[PDB]
Write a protein that binds this ligand. Structure first.
Ligand SMILES: CCCCCCCC/C=C/CCCCCCCC(=O)O[C@@H](COC(=O)CCCCCCCCCCCCCCC)COP(=O)([O-])OCC[N+](C)(C)C
Ligand SMILES: CCCCCCCC/C=C/CCCCCCCC(=O)O[C@@H](COC(=O)CCCCCCCCCCCCCCC)COP(=O)([O-])OCC[N+](C)(C)C
Ligand SMILES: CCCCCCCC/C=C\CCCCCCCC(=O)O[C@@H](COC(=O)CCCCCCCCCCCCCCC)COP(=O)([O-])OCC[N+](C)(C)C
Ligand SMILES: CCCCCCCC/C=C\CCCCCCCC(=O)O[C@@H](COC(=O)CCCCCCCCCCCCCCC)COP(=O)([O-])OCC[N+](C)(C)C
Ligand SMILES: CCCCCCCC/C=C\CCCCCCCC(=O)O[C@@H](COC(=O)CCCCCCCCCCCCCCC)COP(=O)([O-])OCC[N+](C)(C)C
Ligand SMILES: C[C@@H]1CC[C@@]2(OC1)O[C@H]1C[C@H]3[C@@H]4CC=C5C[C@@H](OCCC(CO)CO)CC[C@]5(C)[C@H]4CC[C@]3(C)[C@H]1[C@@H]2C
Ligand SMILES: [Ca+2]
Lengths: 90, 90
């Protein structure tokens, strides 16, 4: 989760000062991704259907690649390993 | 994923020139479908609650049938096979 959250925030929000909101932003949306949410119209902030058009900038085309890797790891590896854990220890 | 993505794009967007955006569009939404997103108001683009009314045209009534088959295959067959793989190899 943190491996994803910290780059996502740093790439999309560079002009930020220190604040405790940084601690929420690196942890909040990545957690909710585990639970069926995708933030579809926040991926690819430079698209025409985007809800974050003010956030388009240099290097933002990276964040869809990052999130694709993130959810591959959490669901296809880690959620199913956890299912497999319980099935074999029940 | 590609078996679905290529027809979906071709039927809904016919008047397109060559571009590398075609490589994103055949792969992007089908991937996010695996992870709990449905794009509910983009199915049946000719409906009244649709968010893509400019995309209604000849042959677009096919894309709900395609997506129904797609998700049947990915979740009910392929995600559960993968769960069954891990449970039996753990
Ligand atoms: C993994 C590491 C990640 C990083 C974290 C490390 C650092 C941790 C940080 C620690 C200190 C944070 C200090 C915040 C100070 C400023 C807040 C402020 O001004 O008011 C905010 C209140 O915000 C709160 O009341 C936050 C309370 C602390 C958060 C919980 C700490 C973490 C542990 C949890 C343990 C349990 C977890 C679950 C497990 C059981 C008000 O903001 P708002 O109202 O929302 O918005 C403005 C609107 N307004 C006008 C109404 C005001
Ligand atoms: C399966 C087969 C599918 C088909 C693929 C085959 C072909 C592959 C293609 C390859 C070449 C693509 C060339 C694109 C050139 C144009 C881009 C451009 O103009 O700028 C874009 C940057 O876009 C990029 O920087 C894209 C970077 C390459 C994509 C990754 C390659 C695939 C491998 C990945 C490996 C890892 C995968 C994960 C696994 C670990 C800017 O666009 P934007 O900013 O978003 O929007 C405009 C806004 N603006 C005003 C700010 C500019
Ligand atoms: C070991 C594992 C290897 C995996 C294989 C490799 C994976 C395939 C790799 C890559 C596919 C091709 C990548 C994009 C091609 C270039 C895009 C481009 O030029 O412009 C686009 C930039 O768009 C971006 O920069 C975002 C790139 C898409 C990220 C895809 C992640 C999710 C899907 C991947 C995961 C599922 C993969 C399923 C595989 C079948 C936009 O077009 P434009 O003209 O620049 O601007 C349009 C204007 N607009 C922005 C305002 C609308
Ligand atoms: C992978 C196999 C090779 C595939 C093909 C080649 C791809 C590979 C390599 C190269 C592609 C990198 C360059 C793409 C530039 C296109 C976008 C552009 O025009 O400008 C970009 C700026 O970007 C920069 O200024 C630098 C960006 C790249 C540096 C970081 C490297 C990340 C990958 C390193 C590791 C990857 C290794 C991963 C291996 C799995 C985007 O910004 P903009 O669009 O100018 O936005 C203007 C916005 N404005 C108007 C508000 C100001
Ligand atoms: C399956 C058992 C049989 C069931 C009953 C019969 C069904 C079976 C057969 C036949 C039904 C096909 C004709 C439907 C036409 C109705 C829509 C219409 O009015 O025009 C259509 C145009 O469409 C065309 O011009 C041609 C469409 C059919 C060709 C492709 C065949 C696909 C299925 C072949 C394989 C299937 C096999 C699958 C087997 C599992 C849609 O366009 P429009 O509405 O005119 O839109 C106007 C928009 N405008 C105003 C912007 C311009
Ligand atoms: C392994 C883990 C990963 C790394 C990590 O944990 C361990 O390392 C920690 C360091 C933290 C920052 C240290 C100092 C400050 C300054 C403070 O300044 C108040 C400014 C204003 C408030 O409104 C009042 O003037 C704001 C918070 C900030 C930037 C921390 C954010 C969280 C960070 C990045 C944490 C991060 C999650
Ligand atoms: Ca969901």
């Amino acid at each position: 989760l943190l491996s994803f959250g910290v780059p996502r925030k740093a790439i999309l929000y560079p002009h930020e000062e220190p604040s405790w909101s940084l601690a929420k932003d690196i942890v909040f949306h990545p957690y909710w991704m585990i639970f069926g949410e995708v933030y579809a119209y926040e991926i690819d902030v430079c698209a025409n259907d985007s809800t974050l058009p003010t956030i388009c900038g240099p290097g933002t085309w990276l964040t869809p690649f990052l999130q694709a890797v993130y959810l591959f790891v959490q669901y296809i590896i880690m959620v199913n390993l956890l299912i497999a854990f319980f099935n074999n220890v029940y």
